[PDB]
Amino acid sequence: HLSRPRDIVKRSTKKYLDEPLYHRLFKDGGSEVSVRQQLNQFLKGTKHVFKWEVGDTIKKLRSRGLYYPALKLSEVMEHRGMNKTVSDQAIHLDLVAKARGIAAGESYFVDLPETSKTELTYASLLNCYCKELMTEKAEGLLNKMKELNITVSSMSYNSLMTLYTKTGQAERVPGMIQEMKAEDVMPDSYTYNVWMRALAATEDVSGVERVIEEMNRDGRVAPDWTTYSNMASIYVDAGLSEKAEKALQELEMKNTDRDFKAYQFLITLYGRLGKLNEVYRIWRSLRLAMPKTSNVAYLNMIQVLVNLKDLPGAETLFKEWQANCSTYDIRVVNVMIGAYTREGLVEKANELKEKSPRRGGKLNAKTWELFMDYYVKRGETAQALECITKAVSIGKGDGGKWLPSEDTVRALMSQFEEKKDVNGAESLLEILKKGTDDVGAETFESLIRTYAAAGKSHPAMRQRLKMEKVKVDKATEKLLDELC
RNA sequence: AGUUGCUUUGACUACAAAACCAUGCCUCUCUCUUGGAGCGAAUUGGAUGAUCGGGCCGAGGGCAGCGUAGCGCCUCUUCCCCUCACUCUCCUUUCCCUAAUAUGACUUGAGUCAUCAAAGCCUUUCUGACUCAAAAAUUUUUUAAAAAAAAAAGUCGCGUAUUUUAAUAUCGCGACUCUAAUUUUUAGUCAAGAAGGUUGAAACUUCCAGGAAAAAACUUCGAAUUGGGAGGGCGAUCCUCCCGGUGAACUGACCGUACCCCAAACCGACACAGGUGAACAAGUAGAGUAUACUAGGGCGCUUGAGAGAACCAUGUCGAAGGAACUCGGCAAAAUGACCCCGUAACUUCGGGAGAAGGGGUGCUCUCCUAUCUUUUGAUUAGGAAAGCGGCACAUACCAGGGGGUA
RNA sequence: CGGAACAGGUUUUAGAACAGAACUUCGAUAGGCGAGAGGUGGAAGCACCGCGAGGUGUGGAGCCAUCUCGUACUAAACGAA
Ligand SMILES: [K+]
Ligand SMILES: [K+]
Ligand SMILES: [K+]
Ligand SMILES: [Mg+2]
Ligand SMILES: [Mg+2]
Ligand SMILES: [Mg+2]
Ligand SMILES: [Mg+2]
Ligand SMILES: [Mg+2]
Ligand SMILES: [Mg+2]
Ligand SMILES: [Mg+2]
Ligand SMILES: [Mg+2]
Ligand SMILES: [Mg+2]
Ligand SMILES: [Mg+2]
Ligand SMILES: [Mg+2]
Ligand SMILES: [Mg+2]
Ligand SMILES: [Mg+2]
Ligand SMILES: [Mg+2]
Ligand SMILES: [Mg+2]
Ligand SMILES: [Mg+2]
Ligand SMILES: [Mg+2]
Ligand SMILES: [Mg+2]
Ligand SMILES: [Mg+2]
Ligand SMILES: [Mg+2]
Ligand SMILES: [Mg+2]
Ligand SMILES: [Mg+2]
Ligand SMILES: [Mg+2]
């Protein structure tokens, strides 16, 4: 067409790619490794792409959390002659701050031309400040925008209110609503969502009703499914059931595009509301809308059925998932493992655990966490320490360190007190050294009573000075000084 | 010396949505590319009930030709096909509406902005995935010992009976497809990155005239400083092996650096039209670094105002004639480019030769070919063919006079 | 002839400077403006024909080195010098 002359179907195959770049980079899947491999293969080739094609590929990569390939594509395409606009510079500033850190984003903003330091790049840097939970730099940049007569849109106000709600100072949001209404900046739907979230955060349920009433009477913001999802979440957490039913029915009515996330919200909010038939109806609607249902929807649905005490239905849906899964996700298997171990059916959970790695899903720290929770609840410590070692050695899936919960360690040390197991207590302390460094409160401050079986260790109050000093209770040094 | 490389390559699409609550274990575990559940219609469907009409088969008595069984004729309604209603739970074809199909909704009018080491090779080095390899795990076979090996699911089909009814299961089989698992470790490969160096900066071919030196630098080897370990030692800090041995959040002294440098600053007595290495040097026309014009950068040349005689210098043009000029065609004029045709005497067979002599050349349209067209259903180059304008189409600039004979 | 002749200014049929000749405001000396002659040869704009290069009409069109005529608008006595 004349309005869109750079057609991606009719373009020459000698100069350009045979397929769109946002299809080419996701040819082998949406994983980070495959996308980086496809980007490396594309950048070594001789076929070219459009500017809007690169922009669409960057926006598609941003929506899936692939910030490094988006930043690499933007930088290499800019180095090859694709000149950035101010909007592209704001997008690139956000990409730099997402992939390399906020200091690199500030360095990119400083090195920008002075004519490129406009409302778009200022708003992008403000959003990057608000996402990183830095209130001082966000307030300083907002005051700098107000000083230089740079217009603060509703998006920047929304980012500031989200920062206030996430930090804990949610009382400042209703002041910011009137501040926004003072400068004739009109709210969007997210403004009302974060406003009702902040009003529910200050233990004011009745404030949500005037927000939705004035949104209806505003006449310039059309409600969507996220507004009713926010209302339904507020009503479910507040204990109100009928208003949650009305909000979820409105969410179903407003979900005209059959969004996957809205279906997850519907399934989980009916799951927390306890209505099983509504859960099954939403599941049938989702399976109608998504003929090849992904692992995330099964992971939510089977967990909801387990929570609502429908174990044969959860088993049937798990068997249906097992026969159609392209990737054997371990989280769906962990749902059934937790369901079996919480009900004492350890044989089925052990069968699932011993048959899962051949099916394609290696065990993570959550599987061993469920098993050690079962062993702690049953009272067996030797089998629990093995699962603790397995979960510590596996670690978290995002690269972090896995540690047992405080209550579980407290219960396990209480179990070691009764059987006078000094060796098991020392092994648990060794694992807690291997996991963290502080480990001081109730972990071994009153747990010197485990030593009251046969003798005591050498250092005689010099051991408790090594782990950055721990102070024991006043009733614990009596038997400690008795054995010196 | 000649080739092949070094020789730049792209974008122009207008776009802050990147700000989120449920669950959470890295919650899209990897979603690139799926039409609608419209209270929307028309031919069709049907989960339904009767009436009328038509048509087999069939039923008995018979008129019928046998000792059983007949061929035409005569009374009947089931069963099926239709029709009027009830009707949305299944199928077929199309239309409307809504969704999606990449954002938003004149100045490349011959430009602007980027880029200007890409691609390789060699050392390391962090992290992933796969592969063994190998051992420890269990079964079979062979003689407690040795050899070979599967483990988990989905789909199709066959023969056979167990519930207080989740029998879509349990019993044995034949076939197909998919996955690699408990622990330990090596060696490897790929993948994704981070530090160094190094090549590109030259390679090949041919030729004769046969194309620097240097314990400088570099690679190697030896010995090794003020170091750290492991075994001998009736010893004296001795002997033999191993690692390190120029390493860095050490330090890198001294001298030049202004300014001119085709020039008014250097060599010429001058602020002198002379002389003064190499490197870089955008665009259009062009074979070109020729030549014309040109931005950028630099400069207007350190005497001017008038007048527009002779004469002198340097240029433009010139009737008719065309070397009669003169020592002599001196000077000038002329020729001049590319493509095509054509090219003599003579010759040492290499030449002569661009011999000489001729023709065409602009623009527009349309075909044909190709350009080894990185926007291939329209652009450049070449050729045909038909037209258009002028005195003139190598239109300016640039750019052989030719022949005969001593 | 006797406040004559010069000089100055605008010029030119004259001219190296000088000299000559014309005119010097009750003035056409030069410039300008207007008209005509003369040269060139058919402007622009618009319309029509053609795919196009281009062609046709409006229309001896448009333009102006010179020459003549008209005309004090400017400079020559604007010399209340
Ligand atoms: K110099
Ligand atoms: K020139
Ligand atoms: K003169
Ligand atoms: Mg040496
Ligand atoms: Mg200098
Ligand atoms: Mg001299
Ligand atoms: Mg000099
Ligand atoms: Mg000079
Ligand atoms: Mg030349
Ligand atoms: Mg030149
Ligand atoms: Mg200039
Ligand atoms: Mg001078
Ligand atoms: Mg003269
Ligand atoms: Mg003549
Ligand atoms: Mg003549
Ligand atoms: Mg002649
Ligand atoms: Mg003569
Ligand atoms: Mg003579
Ligand atoms: Mg003579
Ligand atoms: Mg001559
Ligand atoms: Mg000449
Ligand atoms: Mg041509
Ligand atoms: Mg005179
Ligand atoms: Mg006059
Ligand atoms: Mg005439
Ligand atoms: Mg003209």
DSSP string, A393-450: HH--TTS------HHHHHHHHHHHHHHT-HHHHHHHHHHHHHH-S---SSSSSSGGGG
Interatomic CA distance for residues A403 and A39, integer angstroms: 37
Q: Kindly state the tokens that stand for A56.
A: 């669409």
Distance CA A394, CA A364 (A): 6
Written as one letter, the residue type at A453 is A
Q: Is the CB of A353 under 7 A from strand B?
A: no
- DSSP-assigned beta bridge partners for residue A48: A16
A334 Cβ contacts chain B strand, under 7 Å: yes
Nucleotide nearest to A157 (CA to C1'): B19
Q: Are A266 and A251 in contact (CB under 8 A)?
A: yes
Of the candidates A225, A234, A232, A223, the one whose C-alpha atom is nearest the C-alpha of residue A198 is A234
| Ligand 21 center to A385 CA (angstroms) | 111
Residues of chain A by 3-state class (helix, strand, coil), percent to 5: 65, 0, 35
Alpha helices per DSSP H over A225-364: 225-238, 242-254, 260-273, 276-289, 295-307, 311-322, 330-342, 346-359
Distance A394 CA to B47 C1' (A): 60
CA of A375 to C1' of B58 (A): 82
Largest CA distance in chain A: 93
- A128: nearest nucleotide, CA–C1' criterion: B18
From residues 299-318 of A, which are strand B contacts by CB within 7 A?
299-300, 303, 312-313, 316
- A452 burial (CB, 10 Å; 0-12 / 13-18 / 19+) is middle
Tokens of A289: 């809308």
The residue count of chain A comes to 484
Cα of A277 to ligand 20 centre, how many Å? 118
Q: At what angle do helices A135-147 and A119-131 cross, to 10 degrees?
A: 160
Only one residue has tokens 């702690």, namely A376
Is residue A198 within 8 Å of residue A170, measured between CB atoms? yes
- Is residue A73 packed enough to be buried (19+ CB in 10 Å), middle (13-18) or exposed (0-12)? buried
Nucleotides of B under 7 A from a protein CB: 9-34, 37, 99, 102-105, 113-116, 119-120, 128, 152-155, 166, 179-182, 191-193, 373-377
Resolution in A: 2.1
Task: Please list, residue by residue across A170-183, b when 16 or more beta carbons sit within 10 angstroms of its beta carbon and e when fewer do.
Answer: beebbebbeebeee
A294 touches strand B (CB under 7 A): yes
Tokens of A129: 């400040």
- Cα–Cα nearest to A56, from A85, A86, A7, A23: A23
What DSSP designation does A1 have?
-
Angle at A283 between CA A278 and CA A284, to 5 degrees: 100
Q: Calculate the angstrom distance between C1' of B137 and CA of A365.
A: 25
User: Is the CB of A320 within 7 Å of strand B?
Assistant: no
Interatomic distance A372 CA / B185 C1' (Å): 29
A270 C-beta neighbours (distance < 10 Å), count: 25
Distance A17 CA to B99 C1' (A): 29
CB under 8 Å to A126, separation ≥6 — which residues? Answer: A138, A141, A142, A145, A156, A159, A160
